[PDB]
């Protein structure tokens, strides 16, 4: 509720229609607004169209934002969640007034689940850090995923040091660093270019060594 | 000369059917043997079977080997160089007497041309050598190609120093070499796993640099 209460207070700016995919066979798009009298999904229409396909309308939903705002959303049925094609989105108010218009590529808006199984180890024979882990569970195209390692801790030093990682890789030997240092590590997953694109996942559960 | 004559005195294994692809829409297969009074390409039949396509024939050619042995080859027709299906191969004497039978995958038998435009430079700012090159000319799927860098040094100074470059990379910066030394560098390419497989290419024409 510290991390929790930080969010209620960490104010963002303007509204935007935000879309993302977790595996590559789903698509969720939403927006959020001020809670207002009997304004439910029935006052909006969310229309999509895969390039060269009949126009389609999906079901809008509503749920509250942890901040008291409302969130409206649609989930495209897998069958239409194809990559490598221009997806046009249209959110309109029932008065005829246009709320949002966007064109996206589902393959460029990926937001993977974070990596599991983080294990750290002292490469005993050399004396150091051997970093291994697992990709986002139940996610395909494993050999496309780029990684990011976040080394840190060691009192007063605010080392939040990060090292990139090439795709399909799930091991990194933090070879050279310190003696008798508390160290905590975590890592993010991201679909790699140039086929895919997207957003940095949440950090994977940390692991702490103590040199 | 030297490499040729050295080549000429080398060892030898038995008869073996040899196939390879260069770009990904071609296949060459061949086998060598001893010269013969009255034996030509018309003495054997070379047939193939691309899974669930009917048996077909490829016409043999015959070429002399520098060593005095004869070479039978044939290059498959374009519409038959498909990549992820089993290719049935069979060479038979002109009397139905059996000679060869192999089964392959054109994607697992890549033998690319050598890299080009290799240049060496001294990174003024840091004192580092930076090597650059291009992929084999007219080769598709270039971000899947891996490269190996050979570093061979001056006079009596040469320990064997090679460098692995990851797929897609066509540059490399060699740090940590001796001063006033002559360094000659050269590259060679290979289709990476697990999609394609094959053989390392020939080296590229090299560049030499006085540190």
């Amino acid at each position: 509720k510290f991390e929790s209460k930080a969010a209620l207070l960490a104010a963002r700016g303007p509204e935007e229609l935000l879309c993302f995919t977790e595996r590559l066979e789903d698509l969720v798009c939403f927006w959020e607004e001020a809670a207002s009298a009997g304004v439910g999904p029935g006052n909006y229409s969310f229309s999509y169209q895969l390039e060269d396909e009949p126009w389609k309308l999906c079901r809008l939903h509503q749920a509250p934002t942890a901040r008291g705002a409302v969130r409206f959303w649609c989930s495209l049925p897998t069958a239409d969640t194809s990559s490598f094609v221009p997806l046009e989105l249209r959110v309109t108010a029932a008065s005829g007034a246009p709320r949002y218009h966007r064109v996206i590529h589902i393959n460029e808006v990926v937001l993977l689940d974070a990596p599991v199984g983080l294990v750290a180890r002292l490469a005993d024979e050399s004396g150091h850090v051997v970093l291994r882990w697992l990709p986002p569970p139940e996610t395909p195209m494993t050999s496309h995923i780029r990684y990011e390692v976040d080394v840190s801790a060691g009192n007063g030093a605010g080392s939040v040091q990060r090292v990139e990682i090439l795709e399909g890789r799930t091991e990194c030997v933090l070879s050279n660093l310190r003696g008798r240092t508390r160290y905590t590590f975590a890592v993010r997953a991201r679909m790699a270019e140039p086929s895919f694109g997207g957003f940095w996942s949440a950090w994977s559960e940390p692991v702490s060594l103590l040199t | 000369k030297f490499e040729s004559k050295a080549a000429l005195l080398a060892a030898r294994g038995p008869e073996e059917l040899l196939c390879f692809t260069e770009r990904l829409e071609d296949l060459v297969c061949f086998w060598e043997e001893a010269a013969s009074a009255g034996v030509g390409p018309g003495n054997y039949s070379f047939s193939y079977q691309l899974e669930d396509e009917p048996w077909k024939l490829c016409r043999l050619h015959q070429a002399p080997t520098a060593r005095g042995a004869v070479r039978f080859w044939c290059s498959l027709p374009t519409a038959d160089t498909s990549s992820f299906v089993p290719l049935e191969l069979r060479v038979t004497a002109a009397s139905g007497a059996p000679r060869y039978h192999r089964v392959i995958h054109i994607n697992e038998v890549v033998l690319l041309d050598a890299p080009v435009g290799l240049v060496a430079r001294l990174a003024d700012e840091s004192g580092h050598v930076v090597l650059r090159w291009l992929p084999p000319p007219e080769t598709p799927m270039t971000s899947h190609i891996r490269y190996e860098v050979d570093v061979s040094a001056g006079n009596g100074a040469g320990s064997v120093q090679r460098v692995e470059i990851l797929e897609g990379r066509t540059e490399c910066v060699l740090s940590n070499l001796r001063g006033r030394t002559r360094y000659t560098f050269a590259v060679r390419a290979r289709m990476a796993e697990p999609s394609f497989g094959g053989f390392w290419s020939a080296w590229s024409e090299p560049v030499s640099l006085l540190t």
């Binding site: 990559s83 490598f84 086929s195 | 971000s143 899947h144």
Partner: peptide
């Protein structure tokens, strides 16, 4: 699912 061919860099796909 998709229809692909070898491009100069990597696969050029498209939904079948």
């Amino acid at each position: 699912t998709y229809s692909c061919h070898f491009g100069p860099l990597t696969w050029v796909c498209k939904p079948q």
